Amino acid sequence: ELQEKLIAVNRVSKTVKGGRIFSFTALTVVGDGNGRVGFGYGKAREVPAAIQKAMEKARRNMINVALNNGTLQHPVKGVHTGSRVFMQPASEGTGIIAGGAMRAVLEVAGVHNVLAKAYGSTNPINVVRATIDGLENMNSPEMVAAKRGKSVEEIL
C-alpha cells in the first residue's frame, strides 16, 4: 500500500584503537500517496540492515499533511539547521520541480505539481526535515476557518 523511497546512502566512519570502523547510514521516506508521509534514518554495519532499520523508523512517527486535490494549498517556507526551503502550488501537469531529497519526499507525499527551491546548504537529511516541517505547519482552509471562527466562504 505504502510507497517507500531510498534517498541517499553514504558510508560514515569511526576511529577506534584497532583502526577505522566503517558503518552505513540509510535515509528513506515512506508514505501512502496521500497526506501521510514519514522519514526514517537507520544505521548499521551493512546496507540491507541499514535500509531495513530506516524503513521501520519511517513507518512510525508519520504526520498528516492537509494537501489540496493534487498540490499544496499556499506558498510555505521551512527551515531545519541549514536548508531554507520554499515551495508553492503549481497548475496541473507541471510536475515536481524539486532537487535531491525534496523530490523523493514530495513524490511519496502525494503532491504532483509544485515549484520548490532549496536555499542554504542542500544536505539531504536537513532538507527532508525542513520540508516536512513546512508541510506540518501548512495551514488548510478548513483549519484556518475553524481557528478564526469564520466560514470557508468568508475566507475564500
The site for RNA (CB under 7 A) is made up of: 10, 12-15, 20, 75, 81-83, 86, 88-92, 94, 97-103, 113, 115-118, 120-126
Please say which residue, 119 or 152, places its beta carbon nearer to RNA: 119
Please say which residue, 28 or 126, places its beta carbon nearer to RNA: 126
**Whole-number minimum distance, CB 78 to RNA, in Å?**
13
> Residue 25 and residue 145: Cα distance in Å, rounded?
43
- Over the range 74-86, which residues count as b (16 or more CB within 10 Å of their CB) and which as e? eebebbbebbebe
Please say which residue, 51 or 125, places its beta carbon nearer to RNA: 125
Q: Give the CB-side neighbour count of residue 108, counting CA atoms within 13 A.
A: 28
> Residue 26 and residue 58: Cα distance in Å, rounded?
11
**Whole-number minimum distance, CB 100 to RNA, in Å?**
3
Please say which residue, 37 or 125, places its beta carbon nearer to RNA: 125
For the record, the C-alpha cell of 3 comes out as: 510507497
**Whole-number minimum distance, CB 119 to RNA, in Å?**
8
> Residue 125 and residue 41: Cα distance in Å, rounded?
8
**Whole-number minimum distance, CB 134 to RNA, in Å?**
13
